[PDB]
Amino acid sequence: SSIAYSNNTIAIPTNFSISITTEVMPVSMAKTSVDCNMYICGDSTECAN
């Protein structure tokens, strides 16, 4: 593009347009918890020791 720079000319709008623009944002994760003693040992009593 080429803005025609002028020492004494100005461009002024004669008309306008309304617009609607979507903006999308994340706010939270899935709340999670882990029973580590079951995850590690699977109800092996000796692993639990």
Place this chain on the structure above:
Amino acid sequence: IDKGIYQTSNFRVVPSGDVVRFPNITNLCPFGEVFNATKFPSVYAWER
């Protein structure tokens, strides 16, 4: 302790009983002839 909700333990249900399953069993051994055939051999006729 102050007002709130607190984590204290992981609970876990223990089993009430035990189950064993094996195949639909068949083919018994021919042992009954060795013990209770009708008149046993001599030490020379000796069934094995």
